Structure formats: C-alpha cells, structure tokens
C-alpha cells in the first residue's frame, strides 16, 4: 500500500521516485543534443533544461504502482517531456499556424492510442529534422500503455483529457485576436456537459496532465472497471486541473503583463471574484479527490502542488502576490517554508 | 509564544536563524584573514570552513528569545567560533603543552565574566600575533551578556559549564599516555557531586556547550531565579551533553580508528553495555529535558539534532552501525529521510 505519512512518502520520493525519474530524464536530455535541426534541438533542450519539476512531481504517481515503478515513471516522463516540448514548439513558432499547432498536438494522442502509425508530426512548419525524438517519446507510451492490464478501461478517457489539453495549445497560441473568440466557441460545445464556469475558466481547466497520469497509473491495476475509470477522470477533471492551472497564471501574472500575453486570471470582473471562485475551485477540487481510491495520496500530492507553486520566489518576493496568495489559501506556511529551504540550500 | 508545530519551527530556522548566523560567521571569516600569525590563520580559517554546522545548531536557540534575537546568535557564534578555534590550536600543536591548553581554554571563562582585564592566551607558545582576534571574540561575548536582564543569575552556572568543558580539553589534548590519568583523576575530583557514571561517560557530559546557550537563551528574561538558573542547568547537564557527545563518538568509531583519536565509546567493556548506557543517557535526557520551561521546543531540537547525526552516510550505509543506533534510539525514519534528502541535494 501507498505511503500516506510525511515521512515515509517523503522519504520514497528522494530515495525511489526522483533518481527514477532523472535516470529516463537523463536520457531523453542527451538524445535531445542530437537533435539535428538547430531550432527544435534548442526548443528540446529548453523544456528539459526548465520544466524538470514537471517530471519530478509526475513521477510521484509511480507509488501507487509499485509493481510497474519503472514502467509507469517512463510513460509519464515521456508523455510529460512531449507536453512541454510541444509547447515550447507552439510558444516560439513565428509563423502561429494551427495546422501545425494541432499537427503536434496529435503527437500526444499517438502516444495514448498503441499500434497509431507515426506521421510526420511536423508537416505544418518548416523545422522537421528531430532525428526520431518525436517518434521515440510517442512510441515509449504506446509499448508501455498496451501492457497495463486495464490501459484498455481507461483509453477513451486519457484521450478525452488530451485531446482538450491539446484544443487549448492550439486556440490560445494562435495570434492574439483570434484567441479569445476560439476559446469562447470551443467553451460553447463543452459548456453543457461542464460544471457552470466561464470560458477561461473552462480553458484553466484543460491545461493540466494530472488525469492523464492518474488514468495511466490506475490502469496497473487488474480488472479496474468503466465505473472506476470515469471516477477516476472526474477526481481530477475538472476542479483539480484547473486549481493547478489557475495557480499556474497566478504566480505567472507579472510578466504576463509586462510581456502583454494571455493570462486567463485576467478576464474576472475584478480580483474579489477570481479570490472568490479560487476557493470554490479549491473546495469542489477537495471533494472531487475524496472520491478516488488512495484519496489521502491524491490529498498529499493535490497540497504539494499547491504549497510548491506558490513557493515560487515570483510570488514569495513580491509583497502584493504573497498577500494575495494568502487570501486564496492558507497552506500554514508551507509556501514559506519551502521558498526558504529553497532559498538556502541554492546560496 | 514559541514556535513549537514542526511547519512554522523549520521555516524561522530557514528565514531567521540560518541567515542571521552566516551574515555574522561570514564577518568573522572576513575578520580571520587579517590574523597575521600564518598559522593561527590557518587554524582560524580551517575552523570556520569545517564547523559552520555548530553556530547552524546553537543559533537556534534565538527562537526561545527572539527580543534579543541577533544579540544572542552573535554570542552564540563568538563563544563557539572561539570552542572550534581552540580545538584547532590544541589538536594540531607540535608540543602538546597543557599550559597553553588551559591558557587557550581561559579564553572561554574572559568571555562569559564581564569587566575582567585579559591576558595573552598564546602566552605558553610559539605563535602568539593574531591581531586581536580572540579578544574580539571574548570582547563580542562580554559586551552581549552583559545586557541581559538575567545574565548576573545565571553566570556562576556558565562558567561551571564552561570550566568542565575546558578541563576536558586540557586533558584530551595532552601527549596520548597521559590522557586517560588526567581524565580518570580529574573525574575523581567531581565523582561524588555526579550521578554514578564512568570518567569516560562524564567527559563525554562536559564537551557539549549547549548548556552554555541555554543558560544564555535564559539570561534574556527579567527576575531569573537562583532556583530557575540551577533548573535549566540541570535540564542539560550532564545527560543531554553526554547522548550528544556519545552520539557524536559513535558516528566517528571508524575515523577515530582509522586516525588513532581518542573515543570514549572503546572504555566500555563491550558493545552490549555501550547500548544499556546510551539507553539510560537517553531516558535520563528526556526526563532532565521535560524539567524545562518551553518544553516541547527543547524536545524538538534534541529530536532535531538526534536524527542530523544519525542521517549521517557514517551511520546509514554502514549496516552494523544502522543496526546499532536503531537499538539505541527509537527516531522512527526522520534519520532515513534526512539522509536520502541530503543525498539528493549534495548529488
Ligand atoms: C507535485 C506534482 C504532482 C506536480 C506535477 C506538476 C506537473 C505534472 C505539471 C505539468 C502540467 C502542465 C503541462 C502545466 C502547464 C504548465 C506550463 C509551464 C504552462 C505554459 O505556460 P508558461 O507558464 O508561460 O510556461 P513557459 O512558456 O515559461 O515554458
Ligand atoms: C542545537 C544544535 C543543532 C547543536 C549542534 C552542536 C553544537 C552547537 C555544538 C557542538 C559542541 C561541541 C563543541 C562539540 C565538540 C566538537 C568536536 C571537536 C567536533 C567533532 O570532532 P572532530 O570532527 O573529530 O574534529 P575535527 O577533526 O573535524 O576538527
């Protein structure tokens, strides 16, 4: 069973979890030097060189499937490297196609769907020599994925949470006019099936990878049922992934504004109603993961996002940010604690 | 009000204490440097590179006293800079001279008795042009304790701390066949004020200064009784000296025999007695702990620096020694994961 103390959780992540992650980390990091075209290499080597955590927290989830530690943790690195290559890919595009957009985008669909043969991922723009780190990264998850025995019980909806992570890549990295009336539309289609929220709200929500490694780690287990699959979606989907994401353009908003880029935070009428429905967020996000198996785990893990973004030196010395920080959720100073055993041991 | 729930514990630790002792430890190395004897520099400076980690340790006792917060750190500091200095000067002298051992460790007494005329402590040896260093030091201690409230009530305790921790040094330092003569007979002259314990077992007692800081921590408060000052001497003296000498000279078993040092663990008659007696430190240490006032902050930091020592890699990958010291202390697996953190951190 899962650790669901402090310590021993803790201790699992440095003893087992994070040299797991950096031993595959480690690898895609020297694969991606090869990478002969100049500008996807320095996008690759970007994301690994600034997105580690990303892999590191998502390797957490392996401790709930011990019997598939390794197979699981390199699906998630893979799957989670892809994401933030990806993005790097549509962040800096100078030509903003969709087409290419969501040509990349399908990369992460490939991974979740065994047997998809590869295409050319990227045939919308004009760099398209990665020398098969695309390819590698999708058909990591595809050979790993096809050998969990209830991947097949949780396909559809892995597919579901990446299919809308990647419709949100491509409507908000378009040119800045087009954004917003793409958001609202694609809102449109989903706004009935959804808890009532906005649009950007809506969009915060989607942005996330937690129910995709959630669905991955659950699908170890034998005989998990279609009931368990959709609790499992729904533990995540959508409150939790959009607290994640709203934190994420929280600590961000800074140089949001100084860079005049897209921060959904900003479309609240004012900043007492984006207070205000943080905590509604935070309060649906709370009982959404007292409904999965190991709820106490989802609970640590949920509580470690939170206290570890909001750490960030972005909101921890800035004296409006942390205030504001405070009045969105008290962490009884865990934020703090964490910006300051940062703040030492890197001196 | 004293911090006492572990989150807000660690996080004045991380903001106030470790930043405070280093802005003051860095002004002595600086201070260091200007030593004009090459060899008392080198010894200052090899000192302060080497023990950062007891000023660390002592300085957080400035949470019990937070009034006079940077003052007693920077005694704190002065007085155990001085400590390692000392133990510098004494261990690598080529005349092995217990005159300018005792002479040295006089130092220590100037500093804790105010308005008294000072001496040159290099007296009775070759090197003596340390441009005022060690009077600054003993002057920083004077000029603090002095402005504390309590300090006249506590004083005589101090020095009595101070004075056993000097004769240990004295003794331990002399040519290796006069050492445990010294030891024994010094013992013999305070064996019937001690509880029943071995001349080995009592110098471990004396070679803590933690009693001194607590003693200190205490003078910041106004109407300190005779009674209270003999209570909080009492409450360190001699067990929660002794299990954090002991504990320090059953991590180092294999340095010390590697390096012919002498280690007071090797007196026991046998391991099994070693333990027996560590057990009864340990019982008799929390009894004397519990007699305090802000209990449960004492508890904390005697937990604290238990599983620092034991997080050693000298204990954790040594089987024999793990097995050992999980007889001889019960910490659960805060040792483990403090080892498994600092591997992570220092990789
Ligand atoms: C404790 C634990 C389980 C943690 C898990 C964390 C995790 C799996 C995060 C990835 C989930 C994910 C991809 C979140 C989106 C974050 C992404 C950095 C936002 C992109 O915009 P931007 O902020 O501007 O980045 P950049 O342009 O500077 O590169
Ligand atoms: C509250 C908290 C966390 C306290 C921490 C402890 C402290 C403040 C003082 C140690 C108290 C103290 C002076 C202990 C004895 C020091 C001893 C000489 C160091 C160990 O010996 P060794 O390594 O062999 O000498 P060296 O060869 O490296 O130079």
Same mark, same amino acid.
């Given at each position: 069973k899962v650790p669901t103390q402090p310590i021993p959780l803790m201790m699992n992540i440095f003893r087992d979890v994070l040299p797991t992650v950096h031993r595959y980390y480690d690898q895609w990091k020297e694969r991606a030097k090869?990478?002969?075209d100049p500008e996807l290499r320095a996008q690759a080597l970007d994301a690994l060189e600034r997105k580690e955590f990303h892999c590191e927290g998502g390797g957490i989830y392996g401790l709930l499937a011990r019997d598939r530690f390794d197979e699981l943790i390199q699906f998630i690195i893979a799957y989670q490297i892809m994401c933030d290559y990806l993005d790097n890919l549509c962040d800096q595009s100078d030509y903003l196609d969709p087409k290419d957009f969501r040509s990349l985008h399908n990369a992460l669909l490939a991974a979740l769907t065994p047997g998809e043969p590869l295409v050319n991922?990227?045939?919308?723009?004009?760099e398209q020599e990665d020398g098969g780190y695309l390819h590698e990264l999708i058909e990591t998850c595809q050979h790993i994925l096809?050998?969990?025995?209830?991947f097949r019980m949780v396909q559809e909806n892995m597919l579901e949470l990446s299919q809308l992570y990647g419709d949100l890549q491509v409507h908000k990295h378009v040119v800045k006019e087009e954004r917003i009336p793409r958001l609202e539309a694609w809102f449109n289609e989903h706004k009935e099936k959804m808890? @009532?929220?906005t649009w950007f709200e809506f969009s915060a929500c989607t942005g996330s990878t937690l129910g995709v490694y959630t669905l991955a780690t659950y699908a170890t287990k034998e005989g998990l049922t279609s009931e368990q699959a959709d609790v499992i979606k729904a533990g995540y989907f959508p409150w939790v992934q959009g607290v994640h994401l709203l934190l994420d353009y929280f600590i961000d908003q800074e140089e949001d504004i100084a860079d005049d880029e897209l921060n959904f935070?900003?479309?609240? @009428?004012?900043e007492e109603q984006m207070i205000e429905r943080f905590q509604y967020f935070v309060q649906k996000a709370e009982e959404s993961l007292s409904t999965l198996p190991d709820p106490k785990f989802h609970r640590h893990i949920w509580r470690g996002i939170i206290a570890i973004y909001l750490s960030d030196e972005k909101v921890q010395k800035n004296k409006e940010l942390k205030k504001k920080s405070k009045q969105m959720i008290k962490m009884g100073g865990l934020p703090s604690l964490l910006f300051y055993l940062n703040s030492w041991i890197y001196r």
């Open positions: 090869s990478i002969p991922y990227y045939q919308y723009r004009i096809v050998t969990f025995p209830s808890p @009532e929220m935070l900003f479309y609240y @009428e004012n």
